[PDB]
Design a protein around this nucleic acid. Structure first.
Ligand SMILES: Cc1nc(-c2ccc(C(=O)Nc3cc(S(N)(=O)=O)cc(C)c3C)cc2)cs1
Ligand SMILES: Nc1ncnc2c1ncn2[C@@H]1O[C@H](COP(=O)(O)OP(=O)(O)O)[C@@H](O)[C@H]1O
Ligand SMILES: [Zn+2]
Length: 516
DNA sequence: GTACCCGATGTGT
């Protein structure tokens, strides 16, 4: 149905193009931009799946300028709100916000401006919690609704509705109030990451029963995906070495599971002279802003070692590697966090250090949810299971796994082979370490069993177990994994007399270990 | 037996 929306003959088109050229300073629309903008200006509810950097902002900022009245944009972070409103005001588009960082007097001025006969402000940025606490905001929105000057409700990063609306920031659910208070006002949700289940969840929680859907390919052509086995007490040195070998002059992020993990990573990297800085909620906002500016400018900070708190507002185009020192809580989270790499389209690396012993820590973190119930927990456990299944899948192409998770099917299976420069690890000693480790565990169990049976025989005859078979002979018997006497006599220290005396008890379960 | 342990915002007089 996008053919009807791909038209430059609408009544709003002329003014739209005027603002697009003179106010935004652009020249050509990108993929799905014009269609989504037309659909928005036609009053339709919109759901936009567009990659980061694809141009989501314009899709709601141009209609906000064209439509009469105020467009209310709900954003999850005060940082995102201030950043976007600053960019808009620098572009000379009337926009303002009402968050916890504005003083009461400027808020009163904003309400008075909204109360004027002509509301100059086109974009009003708010948080979900502000909508669920300010009665003054609700009354102002009602005033705007009565004069038909409440344009849009925009949900920027709509996946957050499904990510924290059920158990952390329940106002993201409780904000459904707007659809009851202002049912005729259209809604537009934008996101870069959403599998079909989260898509349906976003649409149901936002009370959007018939949206126009604008989607694109989830493929990230320029990213090479890696997952490596993690040594929990050496991981810092491993990642640091990898960075030094592959990205000595490249900016990067190391995502960590805990605050102490971030501090340990930063300490190691600083101890060997890598400009790495820790970033998590434990730091003050003063220190957080300082480190963020240090990383963005590459001035004394090459790698930032951060928790999931960092990243949502960052638009650095030349991030060449993203390291997850521990596996993330979900595949959606992994896609979003690793996608912070390679916004410029150049080849980048996504390195994930995997252990299930971190899955246990993530399960502990999940069970430590203040407002979690049986269902929300169960959903998080399933997400973690899907992440572990991705980590342990050493057979399927990682791009195919990611695209199947998001429901994109018509994808070329030979992509990783046609363009090997951006190939995942699976498409490139790998599976041999398991073949060696299984044999080593087998010889360990065999040595234990042989030592125990020798101890039993020694207790029977009243001699130390070294006089039946010594340590080295038992170790050599374990390494053989055999049970044929003709080969046992080929082992140094094993004799025919000791065979004729102890063979029934020595072969014992050792004959059952012939499979390795 | 015990230490482990991410992440927002939020006001009319
Ligand atoms: C960093 C990022 N995280 C996400 C992300 C991860 C997981 C979910 C999710 O699974 N949410 C969900 C879905 C359902 S439901 N209705 O689909 O069954 C029910 C319940 C209770 C929850 C919590 C949503 C978003 C995207 S980017
Ligand atoms: N039609 C367009 N043509 C060229 N550049 C554009 C267009 N629309 C937006 N941009 C640019 O893209 C940049 C980022 O857009 P944004 O909407 O933030 O991307 P994302 O959707 O990934 O967040 C902005 O600096 C903007 O100037
Ligand atoms: Zn591949």
């Amino acid at each position: 149905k996008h053919e009807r929306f791909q038209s430059l003959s609408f009544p709003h088109t002329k003014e739209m193009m005027k603002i697009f050229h003179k106010k935004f300073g652009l020249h050509n629309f990108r993929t799905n931009q014009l269609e989504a903008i037309n659909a928005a200006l036609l009053g339709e509810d919109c759901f936009i799946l567009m990659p980061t950097g694809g141009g989501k902002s314009l899709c709601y900022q141009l209609p906000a300028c064209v439509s009469p009245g105020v467009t209310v944009v709900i954003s999850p972070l005060r940082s995102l709100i201030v950043d976007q409103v600053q960019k808009l005001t620098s572009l000379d588009i009337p926009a303002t916000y009402l968050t916890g960082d504005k003083t009461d007097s400027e808020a009163t001025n904003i309400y008075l401006q909204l109360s004027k006969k002509d509301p100059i402000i086109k974009l009003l940025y708010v948080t979900p919690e502000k909508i669920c606490a300010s009665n003054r905001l609700i009354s102002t929105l009602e005033n705007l609704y009565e004069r038909k000057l409440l344009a849009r409700f925009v949900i920027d990063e709509a996946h957050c509705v499904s990510q924290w609306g059920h158990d952390f920031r329940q106002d993201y659910k409780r904000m459904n109030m707007l659809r009851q208070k202002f049912p005729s006002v259209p809604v537009m949700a934008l996101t870069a990451t959403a599998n079909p289940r989260v898509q349906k969840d976003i649409l149901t929680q936002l009370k959007i029963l018939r949206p126009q859907v604008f989607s694109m390919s989830f493929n990230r052509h320029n990213l090479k995906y890696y997952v490596l086995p993690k040594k929990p007490k050496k991981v810092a040195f491993d990642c640091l070495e990898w960075i030094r070998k592959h990205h000595p002059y490249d900016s990067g992020i190391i995502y960590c599971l805990s605050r102490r993990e971030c501090d340990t990573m930063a300490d190691t990297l600083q101890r060997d002279g890598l400009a790495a800085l820790a970033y998590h909620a434990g730091l003050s906002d003063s220190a957080r802003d300082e480190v963020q500016q240090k990383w963005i400018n590459q001035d004394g900070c090459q790698v930032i070692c951060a928790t999931i708190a960092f990243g949502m507002g960052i638009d650095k185009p030349d991030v060449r590697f993203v390291i997850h020192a521990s596996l993330p809580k979900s595949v959606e989270g992994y896609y979003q966090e690793s996608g912070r790499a390679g916004r410029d389209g150049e080849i980048s690396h996504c390195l994930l250090f995997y252990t299930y012993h971190d899955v246990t820590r993530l399960k502990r973190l999940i069970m430590m949810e203040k407002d979690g119930n049986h269902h929300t927990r169960e959903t998080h456990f399933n997400n973690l299971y899907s992440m572990v299944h991705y980590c342990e899948n050493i057979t399927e192409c990682r791009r195919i796994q990611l695209l199947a998770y998001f429901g994109e099917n018509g994808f070329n299976p030979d992509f990783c082979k046609k363009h090997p420069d951006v190939s995942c690890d699976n498409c490139c000693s790998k599976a041999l370490v398991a073949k060696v480790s299984q044999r080593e565990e087998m010889v360990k169990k065999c040595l234990g069993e042989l030592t125990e049976v020798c101890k039993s025989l020694g207790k029977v005859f009243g001699v130390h177990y070294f006089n039946i078979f010594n340590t080295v002979t038992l170790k050599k018997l374990a390494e053989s994994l055999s049970s044929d006497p003709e080969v046992l006599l080929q082992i140094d220290g094993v004799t025919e007399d000791k065979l004729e005396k102890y063979g029934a008890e020595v072969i014992s379960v050792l004959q059952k270990y012939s499979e390795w």
